[PDB]
Each structure stands twice: as structure tokens, then as C-alpha cells.
Design a protein around this nucleic acid. Structure first.
Lengths: 322, 119
RNA sequence: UUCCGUUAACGAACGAGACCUCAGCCUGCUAACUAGCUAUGCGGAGCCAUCCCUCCGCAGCUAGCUUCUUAGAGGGACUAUG
């Protein structure tokens, strides 16, 4: 069996840069774009087989406009509605999806911000930046620590940070950061020191992944070579090969799958067998110049559906068979 | 008239040479990258130089190009330029000649020469 | 005389361009009783009249106020994409 196609939705004018999905409030997808809006889609799951299988997977519900530049990454609150988004204006914002207004605002990142992420207790907020610094924020949008600086100031990278995520193990909270300096680091929320430096790629990194059980540390990026690492202590298990650039990475919530967006199609490997078993192509093959990449992906809570957001503000949805 | 002048074109090429790896095909990210490596005195100059570098990368990613010397392609055009076949295609076994060629070879005293015969 | 390129020329200097001012976009940032909008209170006038509704006046420890006004910091356009 495999992944299958249902439709494509078009709600963003420019390249979609992130999708996030909830686990407790399921039929509410949220996607960010280079349009400073932040769209939220509602799911009755229509397939209108009346007009040549009329193409719409759903109906847009709400735009959270208000950011002053491209929105780069978004995430959702793990307990309720709230969402957090980072953008090129150097800000972070907390939105309330039940009313469409912003509620908080994290000022202080001296330059552009590229990644956001929540936590278990939702009190520990991380921001990665072109500042070449990471900063941790509370729920109040005020400062407690900021890891960065050059070698003397500390162990911060020297290029821009490009992505950060947590380790979902509850007795050992950490944060893994991929960088344009071609280096991945692992940190700790206990002391904001680094456990290990996971010195990998030869080109710039744009993606880092942490296993749903927090055991291994997929990271992608420039060369097309994905490297999987050891979360316990920094060990490179094996290498995978995609060929082209890599932007987004994800793990299936429960099934042992790793997905990637690699600039010519979406490539799903297997971790049961370190070998590709699924490629996913854009439906419309028009001969215009180099076709839409997929820029971001996400699974649902149940793994029943994967979402891919591309460079034309088009988002194509992928279901499973049975 | 949107001809780019010497400063933009020169700076575009000369920043392509120094950092090929850290540039890309999107204008905006290339704008930011170019803001992180060089000191320019106007936003309009930056937008213009980044715009000329982005399609320079598009055509680099396409094929070859003039004066900029990329390392990853100057060695790749050398690794296969010192390239040898299995054995030399210029072989002295079947080299057939026409009347006056053996006439000169008889002039030199190499009348008997292994591998020479008339057309 | 902008550039590609050609090429007994090679490498440079001015002018053009860049540049500076004003106008054009920003429900994003900073604010503002010598700018105001909003709501609430009291005051008047209408009226299915008692309230509600509409239109003005007035005063503040009303604003999770700065949209409108002002002026600063930036952002935005590069022919970027086809």
C-alpha cells in the first residue's frame, strides 16, 4: 500500500513556508507563507466529484494578518488554540485562533528570525535567528536567556541558525539547532550549555528533526545528503542520499517513516529498511521553468494525512490507503 | 532602460566567485546573504546587485559562463581534461598511404615500414 | 562612451549612473492632551416617549488606543517570477 492523492488547495499567494497541525483540535490546519498573512483552514473534507472532480480539499477560514514581512515558521499550542509564528521583521507573535487577534509579542531579536517552537509545559519558548543567536522566552514574552555570541562570548554558532526543535523526552529537555555554518548543536534547557556538537554536513543546513520518541536526530540541508544521528550521545548512524537541496524534514507520528522535500519531488525513505519506497510528484506537469518545489511538510496527529506546502502558495494533501 | 552598469555587474560576478556555496536562486534570501558579506551604501544598490546575482546563479546552475572562475567546475574541467583512453587511438598498424607517400618513404630509405600499404 | 562583445592595445581618470530632496505603500515598530478616534458617563433636541434609537455639547485615572494626524527608525521593487 502507499500514499494517495486527493486534491490541492490554493489559499496563499506566495510560497508556503510552514504547516502546523493540532492533536486535540483536529480539523484546524494552519499554514504560513511569504504573504504576511497566516491562514487557518477548516476541514469538512470535500471532494466535489461534480465538475471534473472539482479541486478543493477544504475552505479557508481565517487569516492572521499582522506580521511586517515574510512569516518563516509557525507552530501550535500543545494544549489549546494559541499559535506562535516567527518572521523576517525580527519578531515573534502569539495568535489566538478563536478570535483572530494577536495576544503577545516577543520583541528583542536584533535581526531576522527563522524558527519557532513550543514546549510541553508551554513555558519554554525557543527562537532561532539570522542574529546568529538562539533566545529562550517565557510565555510572557520576556527574556531569561540568550545563547550565542562568538567563541569568547560562548559556544553559539557563527553563521545563522536555521531551525530548532525540542527533544520530546520529558526527563531530559534539550534543543537541537542547525546552522548555516554547517554545524548542528544540541543544547540543554537546564543550563543552556551544549551537550554535544554534531559536526556533519559540508554545505549549509536548513533542517533538523527529532524522533517522536526522542532517539535520533535527522538533519538535512545543502548537499542532498541526509545524516541521522544519535540523540543519546551524538553518533552518526547512517547516511541517506536525496540528490538535490533539502528544506523540510519530518517523521511519521507513530509509523517509522522519514519524509523529505528535495526540490524535484517528495522522497519518503524507510527506517525499517534504509531505502526509498515512495516518491511524490506534483500533479500538473506543465513545462514552465523549474517546477514548484515542496517547501514544507507535516503529518497529522494520527499520521493519516501528510500536508505539503510548495513555492506557489499551493498545498497538496496526501492520504494513506488503509 | 534597465541596463545594469559596471559597478553592479562587476560586484555581482566578483561576489559569485567568492561565495558560490552560500548563494541560491531566490532573490530575497540572496538579498540577505549579500547584506551579510559586503558593505554597500544604499538599499537600491543592494537590491540591484542581488537581482543581478540571482539570475547569474540561474544560468550558472544551467551551464557554463564567462570570466567568473568557480572552483567546483574548474577542477571538474581538469579532472576530466587529464583523461586517458584505455589505449592510444593513434595506432601504427593499419596506416594506408598513397603513391607519393611511399615514394618519399623510399627516398628516406624507410621503404620497408611495418604497417604501411597503398590505398 | 549603458552594457555585451570585438580587438595594438592594457590599465585608469572625470561626465552618465550611483547619490540627496519631495511625493507614492505600511491597521507592522516608537510615541503623542500643542493630533484625534473609540467607549462610558453626565447635559440638551427630537421621537411607540420610559428605556431603546438618532444628532450635538461637556469632563476625566477610559482605552489590552494610535486606524485617521504628526515625525522618526526601518521595510518595500530587484525587472523579482512566467
Amino acid at each position: 500500500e502507499s500514499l494517495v492523492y486527493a486534491g490541492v488547495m490554493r489559499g496563499h499567494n506566495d510560497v508556503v513556508t510552514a504547516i502546523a497541525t493540532p492533536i486535540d483540535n483536529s480539523p484546524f490546519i494552519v499554514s504560513s507563507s511569504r504573504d504576511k498573512s497566516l491562514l487557518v483552514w477548516d476541514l469538512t473534507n470535500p471532494i466535489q466529484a461534480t465538475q471534473d472532480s472539482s479541486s478543493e480539499y477544504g475552505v479557508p477560514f481565517r487569516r492572521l494578518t499582522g506580521h511586517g514581512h515574510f512569516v518563516q515558521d509557525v507552530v501550535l499550542s500543545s494544549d489549546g488554540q494559541f499559535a506562535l509564528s516567527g518572521s523576517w521583521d525580527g519578531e515573534l507573535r502569539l495568535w489566538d485562533l478563536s478570535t483572530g487577534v494577536t495576544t503577545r509579542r516577543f520583541v528583542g531579536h536584533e535581526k531576522d528570525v527563522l524558527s519557532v517552537a513550543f514546549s510541553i509545559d508551554n513555558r519554554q519558548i525557543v527562537s532561532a535567528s539570522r542574529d546568529r543567536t538562539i533566545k529562550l522566552w517565557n510565555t510572557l514574552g520576556e527574556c531569561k536567556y540568550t545563547i550565542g555570541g562568538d567563541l569568547g562570548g560562548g559556544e553559539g554558532h557563527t553563521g545563522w541558525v536555521s531551525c530548532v526543535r525540542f527533544s520530546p523526552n520529558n526527563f531530559a529537555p534539550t534543543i537541537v539547532s542547525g546552522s548555516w555554518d554547517r554545524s548542528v548543536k544540541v543544547w540543554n534547557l537546564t543550563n543552556c550549555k551544549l551537550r554535544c556538537t554534531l559536526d556533519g554536513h559540508g554545505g549549509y543546513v536548513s533542517a533538523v528533526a527529532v524522533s517522536p520518541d526522542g532517539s535520533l536526530c535527522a538533519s538535512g540541508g545543502k548537499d542532498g545528503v541526509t545524516l541521522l544521528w544519535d540523540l543519546t550521545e551524538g553518533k552518526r548512524l547512517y547516511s541517506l542520499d536525496a540528490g538535490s537541496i533539502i528544506n523540510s524534514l519530518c517523521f511519521s507520528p507513530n509509523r517509522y517513516w522519514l519524509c523529505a522535500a528535495t526540490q524535484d519531488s517528495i522522497k519518503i525513505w524507510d527506517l525499517e529498511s534504509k531505502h526509498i519506497v515512495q516518491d511524490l510528484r506534483p500533479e500538473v506537469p506543465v513545462s514552465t521553468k523549474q517546477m514548484l518545489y515542496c517547501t514544507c511538510l507535516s503529518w497529522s496527529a494520527d499520521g493519516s494525512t501528510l500536508y505539503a506546502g510548495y513555492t506557489d502558495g499551493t498545498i497538496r494533501i496526501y492520504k494513506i490507503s488503509g | 532602460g534597465r541596463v545594469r552598469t559596471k559597478t553592479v555587474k562587476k560586484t555581482s560576478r566578483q561576489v559569485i566567485e567568492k561565495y558560490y556555496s552560500r548563494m541560491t536562486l531566490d532573490f530575497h534570501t540572496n538579498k540577505k546573504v549579500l547584506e551579510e558579506v559586503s558593505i554597500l551604501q544604499s538599499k537600491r544598490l543592494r537590491n540591484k546587485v542581488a537581482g543581478f546575482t540571482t539570475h547569474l546563479m540561474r544560468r550558472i546552475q544551467r551551464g557554463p559562463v564567462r570570466g567568473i572562475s568557480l572552483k567546483l567546475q574548474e577542477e571538474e574541467r581538469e579532472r576530466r581534461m587529464d583523461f586517458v583512453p584505455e589505449k592510444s587511438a593513434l595506432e601504427v598498424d593499419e596506416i594506408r598511404v598513397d603513391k607519393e607517400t611511399m615514394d618519399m618513404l623510399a627516398f628516406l630509405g624507410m621503404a620497408d615500414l611495418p604497417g604501411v600499404e597503398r590505398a
